[PDB]
């Protein structure tokens, strides 16, 4: 073996993967047992069952009961592999409590301190004199009485990454803890074995020595000397160096002497992965928030999430209209869209995404790239023409019948889009991009001013060219974001740049390459499901007029329900024109479409409309 | 055969060895010093003071009184040194093995540690013992 | 009442200087509680380390007090629980099994090999501080291996056995007619609080957070009883509070207790469990906003202890005590660490600064001012010394 | 940074006085390089001369030290190169042509009879000064004999063959952390500089003449190499440097130097080929320019070690010497020389006068501006770390 050096082998596979052999034998036996081939066909079904995490232990052996129960010994059997202990439990009493305060209540001052009753059961202390006696008083005692909070809030909740830097911190420090004290026993034994050294041959074989030794907290030697040999064979030592210590503590001080060297080399060899382990853990760890929104929000933008938090809405709004209190409830959710210059910016990244992803043929690019601007554009009532010179001034200072895209109420202000699930997933994600812009732009001048003000650290955002210039900071978020939507930047100089630059206070763009990533495929899905094309096709046959009447909004409730099934929900999304009011309403199917009766009357002629037809 | 390359890794862990020795002595000796700080001081004055003078018998007084007083701290010191010493003593015959059976193997090669030969310059010295012993010839 | 403001760095005021005797035990740091328990004697000899290569050791006397007696240490527990504690051993301790339970020593306060020499050690550091400073030999007396403000007269809570900064007190009030003391620890400081409740020749002050947290006491309302009433002052804060904040409570209610209360000497809980990085606290404070308040209660002149306590990450509360041990000589300490021993626990970076993270703050304005404003209400009866 | 002044009367400062040890050994004087060489050892004997006749061996301790020997020598040097030194002589030079050759002997620096005896008593007497400022016995200690700067670890360069400032030096670092060494001979102190390049704990201060001269090196840009960079400072100047500019050149630096490398031992060389008159160098320098140099270095109170160095004119060096020494003892002399037995050399007034000439003085306050703008510059990377407690040096 002298001329090849040496490999790292691949692994040894673990025990518990390769016995299986004995066990082989009984399932013949119950297969016998059971003779027929459809009931062990249904033990083999409940079997796998259970090897998928479907069912649970207890329930699994009353089903093999239904079965196997008939026999005794392979019913214990079957029993004792699976590991089911008996539940030999009919007779159980609830037992009290022994402690909370079976003893402690009488005249009560104040909160959280009450009198101790009045009994000789004065036990008497030595050092006081009459001052301390007068001074330090005996009569109250303070017991905690966790009285409600009268309040409410959430609890402080460790990061994932202060964790391994505490446990770090722990096993270094009982690392110490061991060296020290081999060091320090070697130091007794060695005093104990130079007394013993220089003696006369007679006065050796009767010597002594006490347990203690002179260590005043003995304990850690035999601690020490059991860890050095074992926790089997190191009592036998440690009393043979109780009767024997003048031939047996050479032999146990020669080999403290070397776990003292090796224990130490040791503790060497794994600072250096405790080390290298340290620069990436440490810095992470002071972005509670970026690193906490991150998760939730990475968890929380899903169909569930938002679909249960309209109708939570919904549910403790009609159980408070059980209550008598409240008439009733008009709508569930609500935005307001003051800035409309932000819905072209949104597209400054939406279409931007598209330019790079590859998931996508080019030509139903351009089509999901007309679903947006045409969606838009007649939904929220800004210009096409608008979005066509945002567009190109953009790139300048950078530098069509929508059917076939996808293919009595006068003085019409308001307008109501009655949808399917997915517009109302994508609309939403539509709305959260833009509050969420909006408040991170708000507050821009003043970012303007924090950048500027701060006049001369991280150099590397120096050379990299991403430090924040007296520029407008709204508009270099816009660009960054760009950056990294294209990949013009990896995350972490993203991250770092804003966190410094801006504030701590934008940790909620830190993902928004992701959430772009939600509309792109959303929309998509728009055009590759008919039936929300039907919906979206009635939206805007309604919605192009300028005048109708209530019975044509039910006639359109009516069949845009003839796309959706009945298991299927309906929202109805609210628009009003004048100040971008956008409302939100959670319809169930044979209820009422629209806006709930003002007075009565009025749903007299729903009532004639909707049982007419 | 092949090269494991021991020396330069036992190097490297003497090198990593060596700092953490030393300081728990260097923190034992500032723990010493820490008694002798109003100690020392007002010695060296008197010192100096009787060195640069009915009274100067109570000065030689107080210095013996301060000397006696110092005295059991001064032997702390080379105790603590005397331990140190042997400790690094160990330290440096690890160290200066690795070292010479690093150089011994070929984990440094001796072309990269001697040099090269006949090095571009060095035509100068050729030249002139070349003319020296021609004309010593002549 | 409450006004918010920034936090301007620490300054050293060169008009009052004082000399301080920091008290220490070499043997401190060889009595391990446990193997997993949060609390370390270790921490202290850490600190130790630091303050021995930062020579502040030329600026102030080092000593070693006397470990305490139990003639003393029954000033304020009862003998049971003394003769209990120097008897009780891991060793016997099914023997014990019955008073094992009357005195709380063995659920989360263990048992291990020469507790009664920690105890003795602790005690005996701050009565000799105190002790010196009755005697006019120092201004400032430092001992790391006190503050352990849970134990009861009879009962051993929050891994405190011994209540030294009760003895310590006691100790102040023979030569003084009054005291304070400040708990700056993320924990109510319940024993020194219940010990000195219906007495006016001691006035507590907590800074705690209070809600579903150990141990459950310090309400708003507690004010102590009888002769001791308005005497007792808590303050309630909320998770996340940072410099400028905890600055804008602490330093009103510190003025206004020095203005009205009239002390003649002040004791001082550094706990470390109120930085940022801990492990059984969730404030935010760093490393200067801790520092501020020993600064801001030294530049008022008189008589003051300083006792440890808390905190259980070992390199933060290192660094925050050696910090606050060079400020007390009036300097201000370079942010390099030199080469001790305890090197590598100060990765990745190895310098004297404790960051604190963008943890939310939940303390509202409203919050501290109606707080600060009914406390200051409660103080208009303790103007008289 | 850098404004021209008047040149101010040298004047000693009472609030230190030092414990001067004068190192001379009667034997030194009777060596000589050859009939026409430049270098004469017996000027240092004339300077004796004057020392007792003025009074003022007096106030000082005046030794013979002993020789240094040969493995005293090679702390520094080669073997071979001190094995040639200790067996060439002005008769068997035929049988070393080759190490002659080798060695860089011949011409410039040729063999005469007591050359390794002279080369011995040149080192001793640095050796045992520096030891003697380590015991704590004397605060300044003076030897003219040595200061031979141009000699190389194995080389003869320049007059010079054994470099005994370095071994002073390295006798010096055996206690102290930080050493300076200044060097107003009028030539480049080059055998110093390359011997402590690549370290900080000796910093070296030239003040030369840069041009067609010698040695060739010194300039502004050669400041250290390794860890030694920014730990050697070059001041190359021009013809004419009168007292006035020289001395408005000279303190700024010393003082930069002593406020920010905080050294706690300084050797000064104070070489005699930049006087008026020498006949090898060029500037223009009086007897109380050349002398403030002196008076300045020791204004600061930390052990100095004086040396020799050139002066070619033995008259010069002489009396220039002797003037110095006065000053370390806190005395100005009289002009008016006493009767010695070397009572020529000093026409033709015979006085303790060195007298400038009207030569043009070829620098001006921009140069000089420019050179100590980047001395001051590069000189702020040399100071020590915030946490090192020093012995307040
Ligand atoms: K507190
Ligand atoms: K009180
Ligand atoms: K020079
Ligand atoms: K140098
Ligand atoms: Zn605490
Ligand atoms: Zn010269």
Known sequence: ?613 | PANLFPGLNDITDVLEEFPLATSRYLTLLHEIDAKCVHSMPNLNERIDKFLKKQTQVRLLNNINKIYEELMPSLEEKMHVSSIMLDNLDRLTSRLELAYEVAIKNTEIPRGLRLGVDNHPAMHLHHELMEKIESKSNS | ?385
């Open chain 1, 1 to 613: 073996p002298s001329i090849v050096p040496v490999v790292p082998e691949p692994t040894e596979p673990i025990e518990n993967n390769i016995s299986l052999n004995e066990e082989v034998t009984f399932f013949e036996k119950a297969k016998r047992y059971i003779g027929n081939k459809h009931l062990y066909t249904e033990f083999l079904k409940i079997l796998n069952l259970y090897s998928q995490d479907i069912l649970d232990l207890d329930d699994l052996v009353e089903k093999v009961d239904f079965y196997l129960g008939s026999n005794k010994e392979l019913f214990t059997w079957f029993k004792n592999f699976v590991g089911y202990q008996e539940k030999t439990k009919c007779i159980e009493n609830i037992v009290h409590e022994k402690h909370r305060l079976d003893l402690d209540l009488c005249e009560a001052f104040g909160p959280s301190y009450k009198r101790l009753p009045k009994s000789d059961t004065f036990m008497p202390c030595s050092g006081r004199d009459d001052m301390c006696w007068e001074v330090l008083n005996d009569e109250w005692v303070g017991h905690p009485v966790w009285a409600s909070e009268d309040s409410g809030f959430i609890a402080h909740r460790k990061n994932q990454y202060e964790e391994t830097l505490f446990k770090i911190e722990e096993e270094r420090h009982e690392y110490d803890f061991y060296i020290e004290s081999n060091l320090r026993t070697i130091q007794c034994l060695e005093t104990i074995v130079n007394k013993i050294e220089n003696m006369t041959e007679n006065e050796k074989a009767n010597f002594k020595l006490p347990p203690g030794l002179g260590h005043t907290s003995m304990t850690i030697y035999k601690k020490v000397i059991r860890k050095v040999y074992d926790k089997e064979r190191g009592f036998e030592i440690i009393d043979a160096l109780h009767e024997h210590p003048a031939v047996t503590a050479p032999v146990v001080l020669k080999r403290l002497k070397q776990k003292d060297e090796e224990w130490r080399r040791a503790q060497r060899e794994w600072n250096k992965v405790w080390r290298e382990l340290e620069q990436k853990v440490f810095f992470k760890s002071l972005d509670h928030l970026g690193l906490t929104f991150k998760q939730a929000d990475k968890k929380l933008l899903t169909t569930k999430q938002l679909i249960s938090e309209i109708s939570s809405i919904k549910v403790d709004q009609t159980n408070k209209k059980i209550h008598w209190l409240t008439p009733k409830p008009k709508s569930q959710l609500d935005f307001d869209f003051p800035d409309k210059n932000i819905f072209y910016d949104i597209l400054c990244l939406a279409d931007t995404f598209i330019t790079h992803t590859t998931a996508y043929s080019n030509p139903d690019k351009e089509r999901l790239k007309d679903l947006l601007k045409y969606f838009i554009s007649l939904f929220f009532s800004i210009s096409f023409e608008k979005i066509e010179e945002s567009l190109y001034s953009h790139k300048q200072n950078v530098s069509m019948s929508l059917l076939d895209i996808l293919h009595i109420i006068q003085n019409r202000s308001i307008f109501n889009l009655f949808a399917n699930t997915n517009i109302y997933i994508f609309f939403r994600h539509w709305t959260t991009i833009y509050e969420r812009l909006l408040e991170i732009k708000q507050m821009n001048e003043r970012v303007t001013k924090e950048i500027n003000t701060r006049s001369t650290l991280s150099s590397q955002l120096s050379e990299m060219g991403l430090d924040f210039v007296g520029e407008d900071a709204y508009k270099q978020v816009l660009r960054l974001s760009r950056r990294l939507i294209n990949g013009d930047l990896e995350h972490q100089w993203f991250e770092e740049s804003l966190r410094q630059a801006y504030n701590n206070k934008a940790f909620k763009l830190y993902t928004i390459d992701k959430v772009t990533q939600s509309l792109v495929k959303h929309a998509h899905t728009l055009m590759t499901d008919a039936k929300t094309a039907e919906i979206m096709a009635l939206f805007v046959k309604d919605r192009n007029a300028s005048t109708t009447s209530a019975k044509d909004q039910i006639i359109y409730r009516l069949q845009v329900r003839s796309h959706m099934s009945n298991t299927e929900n309906m929202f109805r999304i609210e628009f009003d024109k004048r100040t971008l009011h956008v409302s939100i309403q959670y319809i169930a199917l044979d209820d009422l479409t629209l806006k709930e009766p003002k007075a009565d009357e009025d749903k007299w002629k729903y009532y004639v409309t909707s049982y007419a037809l």
């Open chain 3, 1 to 385: 009442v409450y006004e918010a403001t920034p936090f301007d760095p620490i300054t050293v005021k060169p008009s009052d200087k004082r000399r301080v005797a920091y008290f220490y035990d070499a043997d401190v740091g060889n009595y391990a509680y446990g193997a997993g328990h949060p609390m370390k004697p270790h921490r202290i000899r850490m600190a130790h380390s630091l303050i021995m290569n930062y020579g502040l050791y030329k600026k102030m006397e080092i000593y070693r007090a006397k470990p305490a007696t139990k003639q003393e240490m029954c000033q304020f527990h009862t003998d049971e629980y003394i003769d209990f504690l120097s008897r009780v051993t891991p060793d016997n301790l099914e023997m014990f099994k019955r008073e094992s339970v009357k005195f709380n020593v063995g659920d989360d306060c263990p048992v291990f090999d020469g507790l009664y020499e920690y105890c003795s050690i602790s005690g005996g550091g701050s009565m000799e501080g105190a002790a010196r400073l009755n005697r006019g030999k120092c201004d400032v007396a430092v001992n790391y291996a006190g503050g352990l403000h849970h134990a009861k007269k009879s009962e051993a809570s929050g891994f405190c056995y011994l209540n030294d900064i009760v003895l310590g007190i006691i100790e102040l009030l023979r030569y003084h007619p009054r005291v304070l003391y400040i708990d700056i620890d993320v924990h109510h400081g319940d024993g020194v609080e219940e010990a000195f409740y219906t007495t006016d020749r001691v006035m507590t002050c907590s800074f705690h957070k209070y809600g579903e947290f150990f141990p459950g006491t310090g309400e708003l309302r507690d004010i102590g009883v009888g002769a001791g009433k308005n005497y007792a002052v808590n303050v309630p804060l909320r998770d996340g509070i940072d410099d400028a904040t905890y600055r804008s409570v602490f330093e009103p209610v510190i003025k206004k207790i020095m203005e009205w209360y009239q002390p003649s000497a002040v004791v001082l809980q550094c706990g470390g469990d109120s930085l940022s990085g801990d492990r059984l606290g969730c404030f935010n404070l760093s490393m200067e906003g801790h520092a501020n308040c020993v600064n801001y209660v030294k530049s008022f002149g008189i008589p003051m202890m300083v006792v440890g306590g808390g905190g259980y990450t070992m390199r933060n509360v290192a660094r925050t005590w050696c910090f606050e041990t060079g400020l007390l000589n009036n300097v201000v300490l370079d942010k390099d660490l030199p080469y001790n021993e305890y090197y590598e626990y100060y990765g990745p970076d190895y310098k004297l600064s404790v960051r604190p993270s963008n943890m939310f703050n939940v303390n509202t304005p409203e919050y501290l001012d109606k707080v600060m404003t009914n406390i200051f209400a409660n103080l208009e009866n303790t103007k008289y010394a």
